[PDB]
């Protein structure tokens, strides 16, 4: 080691940063244009330095920075990015590379944040746009500390394979890094700190909340609009619709114009649905056919490689994002369009452009492969804050410095199991994943789905190639449309949880903790824990945290710091809530209330703790909350010496808005 | 582009280097102290430029190296190292490091030689240690004279997720890169200058082609003289035991030194297996013990990380090279070791040092691990040269640069399919691969190995912890000991190939060639086609190219051009000669004969075309052979009119080696 003095500076109550070498200029957190939310940090506990005891070894040499943090015994290690299969990362190898997930946590995966977290209540992000290298703790350094005995294996039965590694080391292909440190106490003070930095969860619109579908490449507008009467006729919720690549006149590449044969006049038809309470969400690829309107004046402004012959705007330079994001803006958000999906900014290698292709602005290959999907986000995203109005979409690539993006992540793969283990890891990754619902060979997996999906951060079904509707599996129908209802009924819910992700970087979905490593329970908001079901399985175990939990739908009392042996049947998916845990309820609508709608609450209080809830309360749908148009309504219940429930809530702020109508409480455990 | 003016120095016939940027002083040509074979290549035909027509793009940018050279419609590429599922690599993406297999073609393998071939007659070889990506005809520029044209996904059913590209593209982290271009006018031709370029394949001792057991790690000296004395009662070859990890003192890390329970005697062993007709080959890894008798003096010059516990001698310094090699030679070559197996310089990542490790040197750790291999196989040749004794033995990675080193590959994989295909690739590959035999659930899994195994660089069993010997399995003892002795009796064969190998650079296992992929037949030596039955199996379908060919057991006409449907039986490997082929055969001895030997041959005639075969001819131990001590001596052989056979051999060379007896000729096709 020939480790340089690097001076950490603390920034910011509980984050401290290093400068290794020369770092270059450009980065994830300015690619993202990420600026930290000032205020919430300067709010946050101010704790000691993590790593108080040194260890620390920071260099450049051979033009590549090298990292070592150092580990103790106890630690385990979480993050690294989505992986989909492997929560515990002590002891993993990854290459962090955006790409499609491809069957195996290598590090290659459509949001591979170099950010991790330990279980002793701290966490480092490394500040690079480059493919970057984690051994988290797989080094033995002849002069460690400690050094294990080596051990004769002709001999000795305890000669170990995987010898004991005391530090994380990492390799960035860079003359320099900037390295961000957090604190804890806990690993989720860190996560917070983390996503802070990068300026909160987005404050997603209520309407984003609510149901969607997509629908198949094939609809017309009136297509859309029968699918809407459906779901009306039906008595199914709906916020939005997804269009798929038909409503483009060319797709793959794209014109990013509406087709003129099935969207023969967008206006109406955009109108017609807002009108019916329906936005729409449009799918794009960011790859241009020489059919686009912009295709001339965007060209000199594009890489040397092509995405499935479509041309690729380098989105560093103002003269790709103008003519691009100008399209958008006048032809679809103009005429009312609410968002879009950003697909196929990942990969495969084989799709995407090679790190052999060159781009305009100068910036490596490599580099646009790792922060394209920040910056489609980023640039489609302020379209929207320009205009006042908020958006909620889907990307298949983001990175770290994407906290505060209005997008949710979601792929190709579908194995239901690593699709939750996906769910878990993006509360370390700073970034929001939904286990979408397509299709199912049975009833029975579409409504496991289902059920896992309604408690994530976009209930959705998309249904681009298998035309399924909620209602499509008959044998389990009834139960689909008591979950799209349940979703509806727990906006409130997952609102005050999503502006918890905003105002205090808190994910809204996250992992057991915040021994054994859990793959397939989450916590969901901050009462429930959440443990689903997957098809062919009759039961499961379900380990309850130390605390009273209580069964979400009957309120009976479930265990105690246990394991549980659980048969929910195929209408339940396993959910308990902490105990004084509150869920506060809202009226099964079939659309998100609007900004001027009071809304009545029933507030669920479980178990016997006094509980104590913090309603977030806004518009729903602008930037007004910016200027400080918000409430937090503090919800508090207990029962009262004759075990009858007793409940308030906070009263409503003067000038700001207030959409709760009338309010009761119910206890939920007899 | 800005592709940079590279002139292409015609260094052999059809031999040109171009220097891209500044090379880096460090290069796998380099590391391995290749020295091209001039005279050998001095007599190949002056051919033309591969890329007569341009599309040639080479240029530094942004600290990398970018290569690009034009592909054209008709072309199928192959190489790019020891793939083990894939041999056509037309649309592949790969990325060279060294590793151990993972079970899929990604680049990472024992040897990812940077080197490919294509099927109009070329090659192109990478000469760089670094890790490097590879895109094989996936890139598709916006730019190119052969840019596809865009299409409508919606409406389109030919449009395509893998448009045309026409360039392998490839990128070398460094801000310069020596490229070689190989011409043909034949794939193999390029093959062949690539391999001289690198000093020709290693000649090896006849020894070297006879039967190896490597034994069991607990064997004690007494129990490798009961397993000798065990082949020869029960009639079966050997010419060398390989010992595994029990021979040292210590292992995982090694002491290097004899253990004094079980090689009490080291010095009277290794004579007693000698005075049999014994050799030893001995497992090391590389990795070094507090207890190994050079610990102290070697610690300095090794790496700042550990493999098992052991230290990582730096291998490119003087000052580590002695004291390891001192080692070697005084206690094991000079009591009268034959060679070694060299273990554990692949991976997995988790195993060997980080990208992150240190060496004293200052040359990277990824350079060191694409080279470790290399090195060792270098410097413990050298030892063996040095005395004027061949060595033959084994090693877990290798990489371009290493044609010349007296060692083949194997490893801890074991599907024997793909062990086939690996056996294939290693003739694009310019190394040698053995599909070693282990164990095997039944006696007709067994046997198939077996089989496929004597058609191979090296036979052999690695009993090291199955205890295997050939007859383990009853059920096909018999035929595994026709097998055996097949080995022995086509030494003469094998040999002779060898020798093209050194001299000419031919591999002498090659896919075939030199439309659809062939990842399950070979070619062995000029004259022989081999197809590998699996277990399972009863039948398998046989490719014959245009020509006539026979039946290697029964001289039978089998075809021309066209596929056979086999039905072999399991006491036969499918084999098949080409016309005017000719095996020659010496007696099944059970032991390599010595230098001052003669043994008799029958030349093995196929077919109807007259045959000419030159046997190769020295002492077959010694490097005599480079003072020209030597001989090619030229078979003929045809039927006469009434269809009886006529046979010539050349006469003797006076003052040379002769070791051939009484030559008798027989016409297998009746
Ligand atoms: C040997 C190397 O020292 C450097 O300072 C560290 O940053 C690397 O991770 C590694 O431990
Ligand atoms: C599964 C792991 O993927 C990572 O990218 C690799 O670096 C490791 O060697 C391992 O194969
Ligand atoms: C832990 C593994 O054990 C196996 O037996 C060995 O062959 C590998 O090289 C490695 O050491
Ligand atoms: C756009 C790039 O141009 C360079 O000169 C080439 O070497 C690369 O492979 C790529 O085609
Ligand atoms: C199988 C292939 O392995 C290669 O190393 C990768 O670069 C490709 O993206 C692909 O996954
Ligand atoms: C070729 C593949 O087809 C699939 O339908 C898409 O979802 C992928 O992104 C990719 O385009």
Redesign the interface.
């Known amino acids: 080691?020939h480790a340089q003095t690097a001076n950490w500076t603390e920034i910011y109550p509980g984050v401290w940063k290093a400068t290794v070498g020369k770092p270059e200029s450009y980065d994830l957190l300015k690619a993202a244009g990420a600026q930290p939310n000032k205020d919430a940090l300067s709010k946050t506990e101010k704790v000691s330095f993590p790593f108080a005891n040194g260890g620390v070894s920071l260099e450049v040499?051979?033009?590549?920075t090298?990292?070592?943090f150092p580990l103790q015994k106890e630690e385990q290690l979480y993050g690294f990015g989505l992986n989909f299969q492997t929560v515990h990362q002590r002891?993993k190898?990854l290459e962090l590379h955006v790409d499609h997930y491809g069957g195996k946590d290598s590090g290659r995966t459509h949001a591979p944040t170099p950010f991790y977290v330990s279980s002793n209540g701290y966490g480092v992000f490394i500040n690079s746009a480059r493919y970057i290298?984690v051994?988290a703790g797989?080094?033995?350094?002849?002069?460690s500390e400690n050094?294990?005995?080596?051990?004769?294996?002709?001999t000795d039965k305890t000669?170990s394979?995987?010898?004991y590694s005391d530090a994380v080391?990492?390799?960035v292909?860079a003359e320099g890094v900037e390295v961000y440190v957090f604190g804890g106490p806990k690993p989720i003070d860190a996560v917070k700190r983390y996503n802070l930095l990068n300026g909160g969860g987005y404050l997603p619109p209520r309407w984003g909340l609510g149901f969607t579908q997509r629908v198949m490449?094939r609809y017309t507008d009136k297509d859309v609009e029968k699918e809407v009467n459906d779901f009306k006729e039906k008595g199914y919720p709906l916020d939005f619709v997804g269009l798929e690549?038909?409503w483009?006149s060319?797709?793959?590449?794209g014109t990013f114009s509406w087709?003129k044969s099935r969207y023969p006049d967008p206006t109406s038809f955009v109108k017609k649905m807002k009108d019916q309470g329906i936005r729409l969400n449009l799918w794009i690829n960011p790859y241009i056919?020489?059919d686009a309107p912009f295709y001339k004046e965007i060209?000199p402004y594009?890489?040397?490689?092509?995405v499935?012959?479509?041309?690729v705007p380098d989105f560093t330079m103002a003269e790709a994002r103008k003519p691009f994001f100008n399209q958008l803006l006048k032809d679809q958000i103009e005429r009312g369009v609410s968002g879009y999906k950003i697909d196929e900014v990942d990969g495969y290698?084989?799709?995407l452009?090679?790190?052999?292709?060159?781009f305009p602005s100068?910036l490596?290959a490599e580099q646009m492969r790792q922060t394209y999907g920040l910056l489609v986000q980023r640039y489609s995203a302020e379209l929207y804050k320009q205009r006042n109005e908020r958006t909620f979409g889907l990307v298949r690539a983001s990175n770290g410095g994407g906290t505060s993006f209005p997008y949710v992540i979601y792929n190709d793969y579908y194995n239901h199991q690593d699709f939750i283990t996906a769910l878990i890891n993006s509360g370390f990754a700073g970034v929001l994943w939904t286990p979408e619902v397509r299709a199912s060979k049975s009833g029975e997996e579409w409504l496991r789905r289902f059920q896992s999906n309604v408690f994530s951060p976009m209930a959705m079904i998309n249904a681009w190639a298998s035309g399924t509707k909620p209602w499509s599996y008959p044998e389990v129908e009834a139960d689909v449309k008591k979950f799209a209802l349940l979703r509806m009924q727990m906006m409130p819910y997952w609102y005050s949880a999503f502006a918890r992700y905003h105002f205090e970087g808190m994910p809204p979905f996250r992992g057991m903790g915040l021994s054994k490593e859990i793959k397939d329970q989450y916590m969901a908001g901050d009462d429930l824990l959440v443990a689903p079901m997957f098809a062919g399985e009759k039961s499961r175990k379900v380990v309850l945290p130390k605390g009273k939990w209580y069964d979400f739908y009957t309120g009976e009392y479930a265990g105690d710091g246990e394991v549980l042996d659980v048969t929910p049947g195929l209408d339940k998916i396993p959910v308990y809530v902490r105990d004084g845990g509150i869920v506060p309820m809202m009226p099964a609508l079939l659309n998100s209330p609007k900004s001027n709608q009071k809304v009545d609450l029933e507030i669920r209080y479980y178990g016997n703790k006094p509980g104590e809830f913090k309603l977030y309360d806004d518009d729903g749908e602008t930037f007004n909350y910016e200027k400080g148009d918000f409430s937090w309504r503090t919800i508090r219940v207990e029962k009262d010496k004759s075990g009858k429930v007793k409940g308030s809530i906070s009263a409503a702020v003067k000038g700001k808005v207030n959409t709760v109508g009338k309010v009761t409480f119910t206890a939920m455990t007899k």
Request: proline share 12%; glycine share 12%.
């Open positions: 080691s040499s051979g033009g590549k090298y990292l070592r002891g190898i290298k051994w797989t080094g033995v350094r002849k002069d050094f294990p005995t080596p051990k004769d294996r002709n000669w394979s995987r010898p080391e990492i390799l292909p490449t690549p038909g483009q060319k797709a793959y590449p087709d056919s020489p060209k594009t890489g040397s490689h092509t499935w012959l479509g041309l290698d084989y799709y452009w090679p790190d052999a292709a060159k100068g490596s």
